[PDB]
RNA sequence: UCGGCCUCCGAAAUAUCCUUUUCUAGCAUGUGUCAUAUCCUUAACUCAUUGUCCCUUUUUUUU
């Protein structure tokens, strides 16, 4: 099953909801209300984390970022997890940003449930340790 | 300084007429063809549907 059909399946999830007239208290997103983590998939490999944060900031303030990278070479696998400060920004981003094109590639944005953080057992990098323990965020 | 109108009945809508009984009312008497419309007709002719199209981008939900 091609990834584009996954992008289309989330969009049809939304259109179908509109046709049936479902209320927001029982929307599909309400199953993911507890979490503030969203999966982004299909990204171009040229994008770095400043790019991801630069664009997905339209809907709120990003708390943490996990663009998963190859262990040996360090290059990007293409998918990362973002945590928003508001949980409602996840609704806005899954609706609005699913299936948009960046450098000619469509991306899928979906809610992630019970996201489990990476263990700091590895001492491979330092900046990743800073990102895990502290993470990106405005400083007064 | 005063200032106080009206009130309802029927008809024009469910006909009319004929026949036999029933009820009652009222009386009166007695030394062939090309190329175009149209008309008619035929077939117990039908009155929408939801039945993986998932196929596609170097793209792949993280110890
Ligand atoms: Mg008349
Ligand atoms: Mg008259």
Curated annotation (Swiss-Prot):
Cellular location(s): Nucleus
Domain RRM: 36-114
Domain of life: Eukaryota
Crosslink site: Glycyl lysine isopeptide (Lys-Gly) (interchain with G-Cter in SUMO2): 8
Signal peptide annotation: none
PTM-bearing positions, type Phosphothreonine: 140
Quaternary structure and interacting proteins, as annotated: Part of the activated spliceosome B/catalytic step 1 spliceosome, one of the forms of the spliceosome which has a well-formed active site but still cannot catalyze the branching reaction and is composed of at least 52 proteins, the U2, U5 and U6 snRNAs and the pre-mRNA. Component of the minor spliceosome, which splices U12-type introns.
Record-stated family: Belongs to the IST3 family.
Function according to Swiss-Prot or TrEMBL: Involved in pre-mRNA splicing as component of the activated spliceosome. As a component of the minor spliceosome, involved in the splicing of U12-type introns in pre-mRNAs.
Name the UniProt record assigns to this protein: RNA-binding motif protein, X-linked 2
Organism expressing this protein natively: Homo sapiens
Gene responsible for this protein: RBMX2
């Amino acid at each position: 099953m091609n990834p584009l059909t996954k992008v289309k399946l989330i969009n049809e999830l939304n259109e179908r909801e509109v046709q049936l007239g479902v209320a927001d208290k029982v929307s599909w997103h309400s199953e993911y209300k507890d979490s503030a983590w969203i999966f982004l998939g299909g990204l171009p490999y040229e994008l770095t984390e400043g790019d991801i944060i630069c664009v997905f900031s339209q809907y709120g303030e990003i708390v943490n970022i996990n663009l998963v990278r190859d262990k040996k070479t360090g290059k990007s696998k293409g998918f990362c997890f973002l945590c928003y400060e508001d949980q409602r920004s996840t609704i806005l981003a899954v609706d609005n940003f699913n299936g948009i094109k960046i450098k000619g590639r469509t991306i899928r944005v979906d809610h992630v449930s019970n996201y489990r953080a990476p263990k700091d057992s590895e001492e491979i990098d330092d900046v990743t340790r800073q990102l895990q323990e502290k993470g990106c965020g405005a400083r007064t």
